[PDB]
Structure 1
Amino acid sequence: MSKTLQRNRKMAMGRKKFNMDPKKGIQFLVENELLQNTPEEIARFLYKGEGLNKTAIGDYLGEREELNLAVLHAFVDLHEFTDLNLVQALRQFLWSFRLPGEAQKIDRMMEAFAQRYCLCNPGVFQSTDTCYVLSFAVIMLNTSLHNPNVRDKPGLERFVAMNRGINEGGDLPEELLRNLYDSIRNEPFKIPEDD
């Protein structure tokens, strides 16, 4: 009983430590046998995200060292994108962490996302590059449609034109692009606040 109560408080302390500095928080949890030091177990901890700031989760997933890269891979693997369209998948992924203005880190994260989306849905995009480019197209479209600071609201026809030639030199099916455009137009991305 006393061991359990002590462990519960130390877990809570570990979460607070993580929010101050992700690597120190994970270190405390691992060193106190509250979390196993495996990429999969760390990833599951971050995916659950209990009491964890989404900016802190993003920071940890964005680190360059081997273990953090492995955690990123395992974290993306916890996402189940089978039979979801690209927007549905992005809604889930983009809600799970936050990391603005770190280009190289976002590149790694979005490449991992694109690879996972395509593995889950092999018939949609034959090229993962197509998936990556279209993923950013949808993010850009969300901002263009829903941020009043941009006065050019691109219509469907413009969105279609902007994506020409990215499907192995051909175009994406028009209905795929329409479905993605309409999904974003009717429901903006829910993006985690800076926490």
Structure 2
Amino acid sequence: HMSKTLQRNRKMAMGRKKFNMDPKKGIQFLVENELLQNTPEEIARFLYKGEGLNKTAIGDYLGEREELNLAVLHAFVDLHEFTDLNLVQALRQFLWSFRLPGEAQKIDRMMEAFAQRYCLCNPGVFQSTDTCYVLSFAVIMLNTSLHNPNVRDKPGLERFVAMNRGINEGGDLPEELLRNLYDSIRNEPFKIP
């Protein structure tokens, strides 16, 4: 009925604000008030939708070390569909969905989860998930190098190719793959939330 519905709608809006102040407190409010089911999948779907949520707060919640948060991270990554996307296309979408936290161990966990998912979704591209991880950071580094004017000397394709020798189970990645990723980043910098 109507009274319950209107009160719930306002409470949801309050929960979102609470989340943005402190993600754990926000989710606690939504759970305790039966506005959100306390499962990894439902929490992850809530964060992926991201309505009225600050992307920095989303990344903060996703980078917590405790069991439920780890499970939400895994479920959240599983919501991304990377089939038939090149690595840059996939990274654009992932990196837009939340703002990475500052802490190296958290970022490592997030990018490893990303790497695993990309590779599962595109099994023929990289035989090793280490290769996918290293090349993911290679792309992020190229984005900065090409598009940050503080980097006063811009790496050409040949340089990008040379920097990634040996990471394909001891061999090299296909030149055309690297060319496609280089061109993609050159032509469109990553958007940060």
Classify the TM-score, shorter chain: over 0.9
How far does residue 16 in structure 1 lie from its aligned partner after superposition? 0.0
TM-score by length of 1: 0.98
The structure 1 segments of at least 4 consecutive aligned residues displaced by more than 2 Å after TM superposition are none
Corresponding residue number in structure 1 for 2:8: 7
**Deviation string, structure 1 residues 73-115 (Cα, Å, up to 9, x no partner):** 0000000000000000000000001124210000000000000
Distance of 1:170 and 1:99 partners within structure 2: 31
Superposed counterparts of 1:37-56, under 5 Å: 37-56=38-57
Deviation per residue, 1:123-164 (Å, 9 max, x gap): 000000000000000000000000001112000000000000
**Unmatched segments (≥5 aa) in structure 2:** none
CA distance in 1, matches of 2:35, 2:68: 18
Q: How does 1:36-75 map to 2 (within 5 A)?
A: 36-75=37-76
Paired residues of 2:63 and 2:106 also in contact (CA < 8 A): yes
In structure 2, C-alpha distance between the alignment counterparts of 1:101 and 1:61, rounded to whole Å: 12
Does the 8 A contact of 2:43 with 2:72 survive in 1? Answer: yes
For residues 78 and 132 of structure 1, the distance between their equivalents in structure 2, rounded to whole angstroms, comes to 19
Give the drift of 1:48. 0.2
Q: Please give the secondary structure, in 2, of the residue aligned with 1:97.
A: coil
- Give aligned pairs, total: 192
State the secondary structure of the residue aligned to 1:184.
Answer: helix
Superposition TM-score, scaled by structure 2 size: 0.99
Distance 2:99 2:164 in 1: 26
Cα offsets for 1:44-94 (capped at 9, x unmatched) = 000000000000000000000000000000000000000000000000000
